């Protein structure tokens, strides 16, 4: 109706104001608190900035186009479409950049985490990310939108041509999903291998320690039946198995301590092995001086290392789940558009792309950007507290 245009324009203005307020609050929480300015926040800022410009550009300029009468030129219309692609693809490309940074920080942690690269490239990536979207969306459709008819002006002219639509669909969405999944799988597999070797090696060390303690308990309660050799045989085996569990001077500290321990057990055994009448009352107590002084350091140190690997695994799992739910929301919002333009390309001359659901789809992509700052504080609750 005639009165519906004003109501829809007011609703669109309210939605744009809400999006702008959310993004401004996110930017303020970023710029005020200096704690969220590390590597874990440089590649996340554009996710709250680019889409922000959408609320300033896409939603308002759409009002004269639909609610009011079209009073803008074609150049203005193109620029709007241009902002729409640049700011849109920027989100998924920043997600890809975050995934690549995490892959470099986890897979190449032996060199990147130990020695961080210069920051002069960080911004060099960020802006490039934007221009990347341009190189994907800027020129191509510009060459293919050369149509004379003015029907569906700010609808892209490169439609109804299934080849470019199919190619772009893949580049904009499928290719990013691949890179993100590859990086996440590499990170998870590397961390599982780092923890599996640790879990097994620490379990083997604990089993050897438990066996050495059970044998030493019997050694302390020596029997008159010359049972020292039967208990020490097991003790020697335990020591030799725990000695070969490699976690340099630090390795020599560990190895030498074990060598001493094995030599102490070897001399303790001598009395029983010789068959000499005197076993010196099973004098292998001195092992307690070596058990709690030399080999205790690694028994405590390696345990802490396993704990470090586990927290890291939980943090990587949280980050992977966050990236996964972000990509899932993006896909759920983007798919209705891709399912209403490459399947309806068979007929587009008259009333083909003109329908309610297609307009709803256009809104849905904008909505992805509306909920983006709503689900952004879900990753870090600092914004919520501040």
């Amino acid at each position: 109706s005639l009165s519906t245009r004003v109501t829809l324009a007011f609703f669109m203005s309210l939605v744009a104001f809400a999006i702008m307020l959310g993004n401004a609050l996110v930017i303020l929480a970023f710029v005020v608190d200096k704690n969220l300015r590390h590597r874990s926040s440089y590649f996340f800022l554009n996710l709250a900035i680019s889409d922000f410009f959408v609320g300033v550009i896409s939603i308002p300029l759409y009002i004269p186009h639909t609610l009011f009468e079209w009073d803008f030129g074609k150049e203005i219309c193109v620029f709007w479409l241009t902002t729409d692609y640049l700011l849109c693809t920027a989100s998924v490309y920043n997600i890809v950049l975050i995934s690549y940074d995490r892959y470099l920080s986890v897979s190449n942690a032996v060199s990147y985490r130990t020695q961080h690269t210069g920051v002069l490239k960080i911004v060099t990536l960020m802006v490039a990310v934007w221009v990347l979207a341009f190189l994907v969306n800027g020129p191509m459709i510009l060459v293919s939108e050369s149509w004379k008819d003015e029907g569906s002006e700010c609808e892209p002219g490169f439609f109804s041509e299934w080849y470019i639509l199919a190619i772009t669909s893949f580049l904009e969405f499928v290719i990013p999903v691949i890179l993100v999944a590859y990086f996440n799988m590499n990170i998870y597999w590397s961390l599982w291998k780092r923890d599996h070797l640790a879990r097994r090696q620490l379990a083997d060390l604990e089993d050897n320690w438990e066996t050495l303690n059970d044998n030493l308990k019997v050694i302390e309660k020596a029997d008159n039946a010359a049972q020292v050799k039967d208990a020490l045989t097991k003790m020697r085996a335990a020591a030799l198995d725990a000695q070969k569990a490699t976690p340099s001077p630090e390795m020599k500290d560990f190895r030498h301590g074990f060598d001493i321990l094995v030599g102490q057990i070897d001399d303790a055994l001598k009395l029983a092995n010789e068959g000499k009448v005197k076993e010196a009352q099973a004098a292998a107590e001195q092992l307690k001086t070596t058990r709690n002084a030399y080999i205790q350091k690694y028994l405590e140190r390696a345990r802490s290392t396993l704990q470090r690997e586990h927290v890291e695994l939980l943090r990587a799992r949280r980050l992977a789940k966050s990236l996964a739910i972000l990509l899932g929301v993006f896909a759920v919002c983007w798919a209705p558009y891709s399912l209403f333009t490459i399947v309806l390309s068979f007929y587009s001359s008259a009333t083909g792309p003109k329908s309610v659901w297609y307009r709803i789809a256009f809104w849905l992509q904008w909505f992805n950007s509306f909920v983006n700052p709503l689900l952004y504080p879900l990753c870090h609750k600092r914004f919520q507290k501040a």
Partner: antibody, heavy 121, light 106 residues
């Protein structure tokens, strides 16, 4: 190095038999010597161990009580004497070298075996 | 007690140039203390695989081995006329704990 044996011969049951193992260049104190017997057409069987250092001698389960092994560092040789033979010790005796615990000498044991000697009861 | 070394094969025959796998086990767990030896009629036993999976200088790479728990494996990928002899397993966990295996004829 070759640990040659020169105690080949035939003895009567219960009589004393003397064997000799000689080092061919390696110090006997830095490397202990172990004896292993092999019955004709049977598996290898351990006999005894001698160390010129720490003076530790250990015998097997079935040969203890009638075997005496002694090593002189100056002679660089090891002598094994069988005080009593019960017709079950008829075998070929070899002497091989063993390494002490520190380092790779332990992990590599029983290398550079000797030709052997025939002991018939 | 005396740890017993059981060699699973006792007699085996294979064509020249085939895979031969010999298995040895011990009652009590041993850690890299089982070595493989080769004896020919009229010669002395020779060390080939020491430790658990490693070769001493003087033996070609064809001879190999592996360890898993208390199971030790001798793997000969390529047979040749020279390598036909009895193979013995030997545990050297201690000086007074030496126990040779049964022996496998190849």
């Amino acid at each position: 190095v070759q640990l040659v044996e020169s105690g080949g011969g035939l003895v009567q049951p219960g009589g004393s038999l003397r064997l000799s193992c000689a080092a061919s260049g390696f110090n006997v104190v830095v490397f202990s010597i172990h004896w292993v017997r092999q019955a004709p057409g049977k598996g290898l069987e351990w006999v005894a161990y001698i160390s010129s250092s720490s003076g530790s001698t250990s015998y097997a389960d079935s040969v203890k009580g009638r075997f005496t092994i002694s090593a002189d560092t100056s002679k660089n040789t090891a002598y094994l004497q069988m005080n009593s033979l019960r017709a079950e010790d008829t075998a070929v005796y070899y002497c091989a070298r063993w390494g002490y615990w520190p380092g790779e000498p332990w992990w590599k044991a029983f290398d550079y075996w000797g030709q052997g000697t025939l002991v018939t009861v | 007690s005396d740890i017993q070394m059981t060699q699973s094969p006792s007699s085996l025959s294979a064509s020249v140039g085939d895979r031969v796998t010999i298995t040895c086990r011990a009652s009590q767990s041993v850690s890299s203390a089982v070595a493989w030896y080769q004896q020919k009629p009229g010669k002395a036993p020779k060390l080939l695989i020491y430790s658990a999976s490693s070769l001493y200088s003087g033996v070609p790479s064809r001879f190999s081995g592996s360890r898993s728990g208390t199971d030790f494996t001798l793997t000969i990928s390529s047979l040749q006329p020279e390598d036909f002899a009895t193979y013995y397993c030997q545990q050297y966990l201690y000086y007074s704990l030496v126990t040779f295996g049964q022996g496998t004829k190849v």
